[PDB]
C-alpha cells in the first residue's frame, strides 16, 4: 500500500557478478559508495532521480565499499563516488566515471554509449 522511498537497490559482490554474467537487456549502472563519504549523498540523490527517469530502460544498483572493499579494488576503483556503466552487449566495454558528474552526462552516456 505504501510505495518504497528508494528505487536504487544495494547488491553484494556475488549478486553483482551474477547480474553481470546473466543476460541483460537494459544498461546496468553500478554505483560504488560509502556512507562516511560526503559527496556520496549528492550522488545518491542524483542516482535516485536517474532511476526515476529510466523506469525500466536502465538498471541502477549500488555497492558499498565498506562491505566489498576488495571487490571494489579489483574493479579498479580509485575513489568515491565512482560509477560503472555496463552495456548489455558483452562485446562492448564498460565505462568508469569518477567524480560528481552531472545528471545530463549520465543520460548522454546511457543513451549514446550503452
Amino acid at each position: 500500500f505504501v510505495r518504497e522511498d528508494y528505487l536504487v537497490r544495494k547488491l553484494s559482490a556475488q549478486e553483482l557478478q551474477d547480474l553481470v554474467k546473466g543476460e541483460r537487456k537494459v544498461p546496468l549502472i553500478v554505483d560504488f559508495y560509502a556512507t562516511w563519504c560526503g559527496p556520496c549523498i549528492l550522488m545518491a540523490q542524483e542516482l535516485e532521480m536517474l532511476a526515476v527517469e529510466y523506469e525500466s530502460n536502465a538498471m541502477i544498483v549500488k555497492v558499498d565499499t565498506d562491505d566489498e572493499y576488495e571487490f571494489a579494488r579489483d574493479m579498479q576503483v580509485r575513489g568515491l563516488p565512482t560509477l560503472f556503466f555496463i552495456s548489455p552487449d558483452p562485446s562492448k566495454d564498460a565505462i568508469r566515471t569518477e567524480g560528481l558528474i552531472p545528471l545530463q552526462m549520465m543520460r548522454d552516456i546511457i543513451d549514446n554509449d550503452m
Partner: peptide, 24 residues
Amino acid sequence: QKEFVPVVRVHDNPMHPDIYSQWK
C-alpha cells in the same frame, strides 16, 4: 575532478545504506 576524495579505507561504523540523511 569534481569532489572525488581519493583516500578510501574500511570503516566499521556504517549508517543506513539508503537513508543519506543519517550520513551526516
